[PDB]
């Protein structure tokens, strides 16, 4: 009893039913078993870091700190209770100074205290071969305070209260800090560097200028793709792409503050009247990548209220 005798009686047509059924279940089993395998063997995307001090940077494998150094540190706190000859870091007990120095200062550099002072006497300034590193670190703390009070303060609270600290630029490396690594120079010229020469509230402006051409537009686009890499959110993160001169998105204003801040870093600290002398940071001109590292908020940026008050955006 059938109405499709060419489909249910004849072996060729009768076979077509089984063929279709088997192909449908074969394709479904294909897709289902693939996605099953993929979801069972693939690890869960790593849980987002939750450290009290930092945004997404952790210092806590603190193996880099010798035992002799942590031992002498708590001994020093036990005996010396207020700090002795602090030049920055004015409002902190030697216990808080010590906790900050291990969590943020050496936790940002991932180095022992013997990297910067003699562990017998944390207080002595020029009694050891590594005193130059301590004066460099003190000047860097001054620089951090200056960047926090003079550029992070101008950013609204909607951004957050995140403050620049050691791990913000060092990210676990004491020396050998490389802004502009080869990872972020994918389609840019490898020689290209951020043009901190210009006056930045209007330095890369190109639209309708008529006194520039595609060469300046190309320089502008190199800088803008550098910002794209430094903050992975792409090009509309601070632009309404229908009109780039527009300040619609308000991350373009934060970026103006940040451009002024990195220009200030280069002019005041990288090369104050020449980088060879009287200049910290080893002639390493800054980049947005140096601390943002592919995030809109730098991973090594400290959460609001975690840096000392002297280094804070508001002191």
């Amino acid at each position: 009893p059938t109405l499709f005798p060419e489909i249910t009686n004849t072996v060729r047509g009768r076979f077509y039913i089984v063929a279709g059924i088997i192909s449908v279940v074969m394709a479904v089993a294909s897709i289902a078993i693939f996605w099953w395998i993929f979801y069972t063997i693939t690890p869960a995307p790593a849980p987002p870091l939750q450290n009290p001090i930092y945004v997404n940077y952790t210092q806590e494998p603190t193996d880099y700190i010798s035992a002799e150094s942590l031992a002498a540190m708590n001994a020093y706190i036990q005996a010396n209770p207020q700090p002795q000859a602090v030049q920055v870091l004015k409002g902190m007990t030697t216990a808080q100074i010590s906790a900050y120095m291990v969590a943020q200062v050496s936790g940002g550099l991932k180095v022992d205290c013997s990297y910067c002072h003699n562990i017998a006497n944390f207080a002595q300034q020029d009694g050891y071969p590594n005193a130059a590193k301590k004066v460099t670190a003190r000047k860097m703390m001054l620089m951090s305070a200056d960047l926090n009070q003079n550029y992070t303060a101008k950013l609204p609270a909607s951004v957050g209260g995140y403050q620049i600290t050691c791990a913000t630029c060092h990210n676990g490396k004491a020396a050998g800090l490389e802004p502009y690594p080869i990872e972020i120079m994918n389609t840019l010229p490898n020689d290209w560097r951020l043009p901190l020469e210009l006056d930045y509230p209007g330095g890369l402006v190109v639209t309708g200028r008529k006194d520039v051409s595609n060469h300046e537009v190309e320089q502008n686009q190199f800088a803008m793709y550098h910002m794209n890499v430094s903050m992975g959110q792409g090009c509309t993160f601070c632009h309404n792409a229908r009109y780039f001169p527009s300040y619609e998105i308000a991350q373009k204003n934060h970026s103006i503050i940040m451009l002024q801040m990195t220009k200030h870093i280069q002019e005041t600290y990288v090369a104050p009247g020449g980088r060879i002398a009287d200049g910290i940071m080893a002639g390493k001109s800054p980049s947005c990548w140096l601390c943002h590292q592919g995030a809109n908020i730098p991973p090594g940026a400290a959460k609001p209220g975690q840096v000392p008050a002297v280094l804070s955006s508001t002191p």
């Binding site: 059938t2 249910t8 089984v18 059924i21």
Partner: peptide, 26 residues
């Protein structure tokens, strides 16, 4: 009870398939 029900509905699919394919394959 979801695994129970998915197994239930797949076996009803299979048994339905054996029945009417048995008729077609008669």
């Amino acid at each position: 009870m979801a695994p129970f029900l998915m197994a239930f509905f797949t076996i009803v699919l299979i048994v339905a398939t054996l029945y009417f394919l048995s008729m077609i394959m008669s």
